[PDB]
Amino acid sequence: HKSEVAHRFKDLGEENFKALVLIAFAQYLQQCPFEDHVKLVNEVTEFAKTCVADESAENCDKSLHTLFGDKLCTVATLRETYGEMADCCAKQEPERNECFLQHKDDNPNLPRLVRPEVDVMCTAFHDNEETFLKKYLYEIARRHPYFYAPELLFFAKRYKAAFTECCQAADKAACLLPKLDELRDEGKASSAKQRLKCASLQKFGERAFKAWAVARLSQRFPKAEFAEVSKLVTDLTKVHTECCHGDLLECADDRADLAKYICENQDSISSKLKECCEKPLLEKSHCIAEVENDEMPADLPSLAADFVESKDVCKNYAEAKDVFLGMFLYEYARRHPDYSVVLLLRLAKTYETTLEKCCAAADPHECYAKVFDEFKPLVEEPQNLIKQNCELFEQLGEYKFQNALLVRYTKKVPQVSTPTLVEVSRNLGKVGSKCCKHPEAKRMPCAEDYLSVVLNQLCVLHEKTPVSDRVTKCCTESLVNRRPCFSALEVDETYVPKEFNAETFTFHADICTLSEKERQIKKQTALVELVKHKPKATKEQLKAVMDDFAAFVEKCCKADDKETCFAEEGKKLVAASQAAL
Numbered sequence: 001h002k003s004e005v006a007h008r009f010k011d012l013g014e015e016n017f018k019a020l021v022l023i024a025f026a027q028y029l030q031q032c033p034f035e036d037h038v039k040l041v042n043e044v045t046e047f048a049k050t051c052v053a054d055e056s057a058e059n060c061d062k063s064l065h066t067l068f069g070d071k072l073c074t075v076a077t078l079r080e081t082y083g084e085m086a087d088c089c090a091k092q093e094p095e096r097n098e099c100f101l102q103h104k105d106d107n108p109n110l111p112r113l114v115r116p117e118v119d120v121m122c123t124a125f126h127d128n129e130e131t132f133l134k135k136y137l138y139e140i141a142r143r144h145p146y147f148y149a150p151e152l153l154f155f156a157k158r159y160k161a162a163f164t165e166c167c168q169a170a171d172k173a174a175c176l177l178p179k180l181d182e183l184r185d186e187g188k189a190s191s192a193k194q195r196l197k198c199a200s201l202q203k204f205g206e207r208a209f210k211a212w213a214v215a216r217l218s219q220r221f222p223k224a225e226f227a228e229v230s231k232l233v234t235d236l237t238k239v240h241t242e243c244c245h246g247d248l249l250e251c252a253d254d255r256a257d258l259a260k261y262i263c264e265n266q267d268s269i270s271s272k273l274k275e276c277c278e279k280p281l282l283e284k285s286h287c288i289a290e291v292e293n294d295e296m297p298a299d300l301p302s303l304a305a306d307f308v309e310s311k312d313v314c315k316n317y318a319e320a321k322d323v324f325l326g327m328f329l330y331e332y333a334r335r336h337p338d339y340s341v342v343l344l345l346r347l348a349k350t351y352e353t354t355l356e357k358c359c360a361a362a363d364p365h366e367c368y369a370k371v372f373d374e375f376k377p378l379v380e381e382p383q384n385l386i387k388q389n390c391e392l393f394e395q396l397g398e399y400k401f402q403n404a405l406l407v408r409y410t411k412k413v414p415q416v417s418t419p420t421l422v423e424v425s426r427n428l429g430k431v432g433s434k435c436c437k438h439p440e441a442k443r444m445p446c447a448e449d450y451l452s453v454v455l456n457q458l459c460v461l462h463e464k465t466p467v468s469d470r471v472t473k474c475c476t477e478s479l480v481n482r483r484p485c486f487s488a489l490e491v492d493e494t495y496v497p498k499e500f501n502a503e504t505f506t507f508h509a510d511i512c513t514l515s516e517k518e519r520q521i522k523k524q525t526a527l528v529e530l531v532k533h534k535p536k537a538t539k540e541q542l543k544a545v546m547d548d549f550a551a552f553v554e555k556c557c558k559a560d561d562k563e564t565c566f567a568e569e570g571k572k573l574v575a576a577s578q579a580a581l
């Protein structure tokens with residue numbers, strides 16, 4: 001109302017307010033120590049409480065943008081430490097605010113955050129939970145300055161749930177370590193996803209983005225009328241566009257206003273939002289973004305009537321090409337929550353190509369009579385890819401599925417570095433476990449959701465240091481062609497076997513003494529090097545060498561004086577292996 005900071009403090013509650021202020025400041029003042037940020041937070045919090053006590057107390061009617069900038073410009077070492085950023089303080093609002101957005105550091109050169117020992121974590125968590133939690137919130141925020149602050153706070157609350165539970169349990173390490181792995185992977189995916197949607201808006205443009213949203217919103221809210229979906233898609237593009245411009249408060253206000261619109265209109269949208277729409281502002285937009293798909297209307301026609309049979313198909317199309325194509329996308333996607341959005345975009349684009357050709361024909365109805373037959377192969381290709389891979393994740397388990405991928409992908413693009421081949425192949429196997437566990441109807445969307453970040457990881461890595469033309473081609477293909485292109489890659493014909501290196505296939509007794517993870521990575525590193533040396537080896541021959549090594553490790557980890565039969569019984573492996581292939 002009169003005091004933005006008082007209204008924020010009253011909507012958020014003191015605990016959330018303090019945490020969000022810490023995140024916000026940590027993301028701009030990335031090189032100031034924890035101590036100094038605790039101080040900014042306590043000052044902003046005591047100021048906010050004076051505004052809550054009296055909205056017309058001094059400085060309480062200042063904009064939150066103004067107060068944020070004022071406190072940044074108050075920092076004593078700002079020019080010494082952040083240089084150019086201090087020059088933003090010479091400008092007036094709103095130009096000061098825009099100058100700060102430009103001058104955050106993407107890659108602050110901070111050491112990797114090392115996971116301490118369970119004992120050390122659980123003790124620190126016990127002795128001062130808030131300093132432990134807030135210090136890690138600070139460490140993560142300074143390192144991820146574009147991470148949406150409310151989403152970083154939702155992660156913090158899950159970390160705190162994981163410590164509260166696990167620091168009291170019998171086997172602390174057995175409880176905690178898997179939860180921290182899941183959270184790390186979920187957090188990294190959310191950080192990659194957030195960056196990619198903004199890069200993609202810029203790369204592929206606003207039209208592609210609105211198509212993507214029509215498809216997603218129609219799957220989620222299949223009972224909403226097209227005009228409601230189109231209104232939601234218009235507001236969603238504005239939210240996403242503001243959010244990518246990088247102003248946290250503008251992004252939060254835009255999200256909150258859309259959340260409120262959706263909650264005020266549940267009857268026109270979904271029967272699934274009641275619980276989300278009872279949450280406080282902080283959790284409401286988060287909650288909606290995760291909501292389950294509504295059930296579609298039971299009694300939906302064939303799309304044939306409006307999109308093939310109707311004699312007004314070309315007239316309807318020519319009148320507003322993107323609205324008609326959007327209506328097609330809406331009707332297709334509301335019927336297929338089991339499809340990837342990109343599959344729905346391939347279908348939409350196939351229909352566009354066909355109406356473009358055939359609406360420029362004397363008997364349009366004849367030219368486009370059988371358009372629906374072109375959808376058959378497009379739909380099956382990813383359905384088959386999922387069946388074949390999710391039934392291999394069955395036969396094998398996660399680890400041996402990663403191994404099957406390792407051999408498949410090393411043979412397709414053997415020029416890729418071993419660490420990239422091991423990383424992507426491990427990650428693609430963990431996409432198996434996230435998504436092959438889901439029923440049929442959720443498999444292709446789960447797969448899409450996780451492949452988009454996995455293949456972006458692989459591409460970004462790749463275009464910073466290229467190695468393969470065919471990878472570059474798939475990475476610079478259209479949105480809809482990227483995955484099909486990767487899946488179309490054939491075993492590399494032109495690749496020359498890599499010259500045998502004796503070191504690479506030398507193992508010691510330490511291998512018996514590594515975590516499960518490090519031992520899998522050492523083995524997977526060797527496997528890739530095996531395929532790189534002998535790319536001609538077949539399934540039968542590689543299984544034979546793998547089973548030989550498998551039998552070697554088990555024998556040479558049981559034996560007395562292990563490190564010798566590793567040297568000795570291990571040179572027998574490497575000779576027997578070379579000949580055999």
Ligand SMILES: O=C(O)C(F)(F)C(F)(F)C(F)(F)C(F)(F)C(F)(F)C(F)(F)C(F)(F)F
Binds near residue numbers: 186188427430453
């Ligand atoms: O690109 C990255 O930097 C990344 F986001 F870390 C990613 F590794 F690609 C990832 F998608 F997060 C992921 F961790 F591989 C994963 F989430 F897909 C997973 F495989 F671990 C899960 F199981 F979550 F799918």
Ligand SMILES: O=C(O)C(F)(F)C(F)(F)C(F)(F)C(F)(F)C(F)(F)C(F)(F)C(F)(F)F
Binds near residue numbers: 326346479
């Ligand atoms: O690969 C891309 O860059 C792309 F933009 F995603 C696309 F393939 F062109 C598309 F977005 F799907 C699309 F074809 F333009 C469309 F399907 F979105 C549309 F044109 F049909 C509609 F009007 F439906 F938005």
Ligand SMILES: O=C(O)C(F)(F)C(F)(F)C(F)(F)C(F)(F)C(F)(F)C(F)(F)C(F)(F)F
Binds near residue numbers: 216255288
């Ligand atoms: O974009 C999607 O993937 C989606 F599924 F359509 C959606 F995420 F539900 C969303 F509805 F678009 C949305 F962004 F989550 C939202 F609008 F519902 C919101 F409430 F989160 C915001 F806050 F954006 F309003």
Ligand SMILES: O=C(O)C(F)(F)C(F)(F)C(F)(F)C(F)(F)C(F)(F)C(F)(F)C(F)(F)F
Binds near residue numbers: 455486
């Ligand atoms: O078709 C499939 O099996 C798939 F799983 F959907 C796929 F993920 F797209 C993939 F094609 F396997 C792949 F992961 F994209 C890839 F093979 F292209 C690669 F990323 F692993 C490499 F590095 F080999 F290019």
Ligand SMILES: CCCCCCCCCCCCCC(=O)O
Binds near residue numbers: 140184
């Ligand atoms: C999100 C704020 C609080 C986070 C508390 C967790 C700190 C311990 C784990 C940090 C190490 C990096 C994450 C990981 O690899 O699991």
Ligand SMILES: CCCCCCCCCCCCCC(=O)O
Binds near residue numbers: 149150251252285286
């Ligand atoms: C002066 C420092 C104030 C900065 C605090 C930022 C507060 C963010 C509010 C987030 C509200 C949630 C909205 C949403 O994502 O739907």
Ligand SMILES: CCCCCCCCCCCCCC(=O)O
Binds near residue numbers: 386389
């Ligand atoms: C081995 C890859 C991940 C595990 C599940 C198999 C995924 C293959 C199909 C993915 C296709 C969805 C996106 C698309 O339509 O292009």
Ligand SMILES: CCCCCCCCCCCCCC(=O)O
Binds near residue numbers: 527545577578
């Ligand atoms: C000249 C080639 C040396 C032969 C050594 C092969 C090492 C690779 C085996 C990788 C094992 C993965 C599967 C398993 O656990 O058995």
